[PDB]
Design a protein around this motif. Structure first.
Motif, PDB file in Angstrom:
ATOM      1  N   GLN A   1      -4.390   9.883   1.357  1.00  0.00           N
ATOM      2  CA  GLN A   1      -5.208   8.775   1.349  1.00  0.00           C
ATOM      3  C   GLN A   1      -4.463   7.588   0.925  1.00  0.00           C
ATOM      4  OE1 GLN A   1      -7.603   9.233  -2.508  1.00  0.00           O
ATOM      5  NE2 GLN A   1      -8.928   7.444  -1.813  1.00  0.00           N
TER       6      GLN A   1
ATOM      7  N   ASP B   1      -0.761   8.643  -0.503  1.00  0.00           N
ATOM      8  CA  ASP B   1      -0.498   9.757  -1.482  1.00  0.00           C
ATOM      9  C   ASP B   1      -0.237  11.010  -1.051  1.00  0.00           C
ATOM     10  OD1 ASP B   1      -3.072  11.051  -1.169  1.00  0.00           O
ATOM     11  OD2 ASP B   1      -4.073  10.022  -2.750  1.00  0.00           O
TER      12      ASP B   1
ATOM     13  N   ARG C   1       0.989  -1.088   0.078  1.00  0.00           N
ATOM     14  CA  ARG C   1      -0.006  -0.029   0.094  1.00  0.00           C
ATOM     15  C   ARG C   1       0.877   1.289   0.086  1.00  0.00           C
ATOM     16  NH1 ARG C   1      -4.431  -0.023   4.409  1.00  0.00           N
ATOM     17  NH2 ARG C   1      -3.061  -0.511   5.618  1.00  0.00           N
ATOM     18  N   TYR C   2       0.327   2.287  -0.547  1.00  0.00           N
ATOM     19  CA  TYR C   2       1.161   3.644  -0.292  1.00  0.00           C
ATOM     20  C   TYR C   2      -0.002   4.938   0.194  1.00  0.00           C
ATOM     21  CZ  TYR C   2      -0.205   5.614  -4.893  1.00  0.00           C
ATOM     22  OH  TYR C   2      -0.742   5.989  -6.032  1.00  0.00           O
TER      23      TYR C   2
ATOM     24  N   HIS D   1      -3.806   3.754  -0.781  1.00  0.00           N
ATOM     25  CA  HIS D   1      -3.966   3.150  -2.161  1.00  0.00           C
ATOM     26  C   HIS D   1      -3.606   1.753  -2.005  1.00  0.00           C
ATOM     27  CE1 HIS D   1      -5.481   6.833  -3.859  1.00  0.00           C
ATOM     28  NE2 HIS D   1      -4.533   7.510  -3.167  1.00  0.00           N
ATOM     29  N   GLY D   2      -4.206   0.879  -2.347  1.00  0.00           N
ATOM     30  CA  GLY D   2      -3.732  -0.611  -2.728  1.00  0.00           C
ATOM     31  C   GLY D   2      -4.891  -1.526  -2.293  1.00  0.00           C
TER      32      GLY D   2
END
Length: 79
Positions: free
Chosen positions: A12, A8, A5-6, A14-15
């Motif tokens: 938020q 942003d 996951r990362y 993401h992944g």
């Protein structure tokens, strides 16, 4: 392969994204060294990065510890 996951620029999450997807984006120049990433804890690992957020730069610094010198690194890749 792992998934990741990362976080942003706006905060938020993401992944999950596969190693292949993350590698592609990294090579493509889409990720700054300041980007926070997390490896999903799909397998035991001794580095201690499962499920935590660290920066890309911090992950790179941790991985450098395995590469002690070019002679052992050469043998590990080629012999």
């Amino acid at each position: 392969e792992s998934s990741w996951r990362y976080i942003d620029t706006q905060g938020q999450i993401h992944g999950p994204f596969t190693t292949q997807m993350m590698s592609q984006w990294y090579i493509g120049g889409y990720f700054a060294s300041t980007l926070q990433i997390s490896r999903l804890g799909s397998t035991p690992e001794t580095l201690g990065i499962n499920d935590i957020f660290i920066t890309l730069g911090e992950l790179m610094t941790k991985l450098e510890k395995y590469d002690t010198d070019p002679f052992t690194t050469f043998d590990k890749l080629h012999v």
